[PDB]
Design a protein around this nucleic acid. Structure first.
Length: 78
DNA sequence: TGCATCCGTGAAACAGAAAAATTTTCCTGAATTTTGTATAAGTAGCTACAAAAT
């Protein structure tokens, strides 16, 4: 009831990579993945909203997808 | 219900990490020649020799 509760914003992020590559939907997922992870690695004790932390993990997730594939010959993401 | 529309055809992050890989080293081991080396005769040579054709 939180990961989904967010939903939007992650699409505002993923959509930035919908044109970068992969696929709007493809992205969305990826984020989602992240979303999760964040969604729980996350600590309301530091107060400031997940908007300044959830979006972190997202981004991460994503990048690791158009770089992890979307190329049909995987190269050292590094 | 013939008669609408109406499917869809043929033409970009990073630093930090670690862990992998890999890969150079080794070594080694062995396996594998060569050579030594015997080896063992037999030998095919070879060297005089002899009588009898230049």
């Amino acid at each position: 009831k939180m990961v989904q509760s967010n939903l939007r914003l992650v699409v505002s992020i993923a959509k930035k990579y919908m044109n970068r590559g992969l696929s709007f939907q493809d992205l969305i997922q990826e984020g989602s993945l992240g979303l999760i992870r964040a969604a729980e690695k996350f600590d309301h004790e530091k107060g400031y909203k997940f908007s300044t932390y959830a979006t972190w993990w997202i981004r991460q997730a994503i990048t690791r997808a158009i770089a992890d594939q979307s190329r049909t010959i995987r190269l050292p993401v590094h």
